[PDB]
Amino acid sequence: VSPACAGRFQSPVDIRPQLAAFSPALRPLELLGFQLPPLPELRLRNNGHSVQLTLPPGLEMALGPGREYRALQLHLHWGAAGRPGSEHTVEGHRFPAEIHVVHLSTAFARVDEALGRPGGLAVLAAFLEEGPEENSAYEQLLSRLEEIAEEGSETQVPGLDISALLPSDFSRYFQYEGSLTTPPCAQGVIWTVFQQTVMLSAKQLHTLSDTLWGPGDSRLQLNFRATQPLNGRVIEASFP
Amino acid sequence: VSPACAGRFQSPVDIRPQLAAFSPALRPLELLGFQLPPLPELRLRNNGHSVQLTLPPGLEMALGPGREYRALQLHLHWGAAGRPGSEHTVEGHRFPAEIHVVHLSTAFARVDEALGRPGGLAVLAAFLEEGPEENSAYEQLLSRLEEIAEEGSETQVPGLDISALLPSDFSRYFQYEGSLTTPPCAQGVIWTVFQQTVMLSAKQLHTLSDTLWGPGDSRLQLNFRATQPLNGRVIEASFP
Ligand SMILES: COC(=O)c1ccc(SCCc2ccccc2)c(S(N)(=O)=O)c1
Ligand SMILES: COC(=O)c1ccc(SCCc2ccccc2)c(S(N)(=O)=O)c1
Ligand SMILES: [Zn+2]
Numbered sequence A, B: 001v002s003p004a005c006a007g008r009f010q011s012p013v014d015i016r017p018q019l020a021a022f023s024p025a026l027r028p029l030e031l032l033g034f035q036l037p038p039l040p041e042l043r044l045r046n047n048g049h050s051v052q053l054t055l056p057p058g059l060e061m062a063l064g065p066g067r068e069y070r071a072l073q074l075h076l077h078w079g080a081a082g083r084p085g086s087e088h089t090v091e092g093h094r095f096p097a098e099i100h101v102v103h104l105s106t107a108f109a110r111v112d113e114a115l116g117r118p119g120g121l122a123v124l125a126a127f128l129e130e131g132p133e134e135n136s137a138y139e140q141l142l143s144r145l146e147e148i149a150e151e152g153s154e155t156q157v158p159g160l161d162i163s164a165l166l167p168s169d170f171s172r173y174f175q176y177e178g179s180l181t182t183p184p185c186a187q188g189v190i191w192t193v194f195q196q197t198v199m200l201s202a203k204q205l206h207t208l209s210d211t212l213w214g215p216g217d218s219r220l221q222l223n224f225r226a227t228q229p230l231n232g233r234v235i236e237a238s239f240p
């Protein structure tokens, strides 16, 4: 029963853009090394809570000058047939799905030293919505979900352009301080939520929500935490 | 002799208010437990680089919701007769002196763990200027310098209200991330520089700069580092 999961400053949150603070010090995010060669392959796992892709060393992310991170992994949150499952909401709207790319501050060698430390971990988050076309970067992961239908299963996938899983607009985002959304829910996590969304086909969103199985003989669906109150935190925005 | 002194994100810096970014998310500083009783006494020490007062446990400081610190020590930077010695400057203007109250994040149990980690240490900085009245708060410290004029000397002083050494409006400050201004010049220090100043008499300012002796047979004077480039860092302001 991680006591951190009862902290005052938890994630995810409902983003109310009218209450967000415009902060012009929030510059465009910068990503280096995200365009991977096909080999070595990466490991894609059904962990019973999400599908998680382990990322290789060398993916560097900066929130700004002096604010440097390395990417660890990415995973997804999703709903069910006719039910949205983003973690974050905007003005109470929940989107079909959400991607999280979790990073470690370059000041720490291990996750366990960064847990609960200010700015020790940073998450990049983007909503997934339905578009008309099959998203080619997503297809490389989604086309392998059948291989990992079973809880605790994994498979290897070719490296891909990891930045193609995210929006092209890196300028416009909300940022706030919060927590991991799974035990141990440690605080001090810098959350960056893109304004622009990513487009998947209806078929892709259905593959995501209908393929994977979780604890027991239950479908892995609706794997989002309820929104947590801001409790006086102010969400910042990189635009007015 | 410490290559970190040549890092990219060093302190101090020149503040250019018109180029600061206003972020309404920067709330008034909260400083609790700073009104110390006369007992126990505190160590005041000439360390040959500054005069330093050791602070007891219980001085709690927050830069924002869930971003808490405990004060460790305070020290000063000053010039010489008719020469200002602040560390920060404002549009190129050097103030007569500067006070620094150094704090440790509650997320770290030791200073050595915090050095080089983002937001591990936070310093509150205020400019000291010349005014016509004698300053009662500062007198408690200045009146005791004669006793510690020898490099390496120390004395015990009565408890004092540390918060009385600071400016009037805790809602009005600049903020950026930089470094210690002495070796090891570690990065990831959050600097908060009050917009308003504190006034000492000309006599008090003279007492500060003229009583203490440093390494060799030289005066302890002009104990400030040269200003360092922002290198892309944007200074934030808590007010438009
Ligand atoms: C239902 O969602 C998940 O399965 C999930 C898994 C991991 C993580 S991050 C953990 C980083 C970590 C922590 C401890 C040890 C080693 C790695 C998150 S999140 N949304 O970013 O908080 C969700
Ligand atoms: C010439 O100036 C100084 O004497 C001076 C001394 C200490 C400090 S902070 C040290 C924090 C610390 C470091 C290591 C171990 C334990 C405490 C600073 S400053 N201006 O805050 O960078 C100036
Ligand atoms: Zn997540």
Ligand SMILES: [Zn+2]
Residues within 6 Å of the ligand: B075, B076, B077, B100, B181
């Ligand atoms: Zn100092």
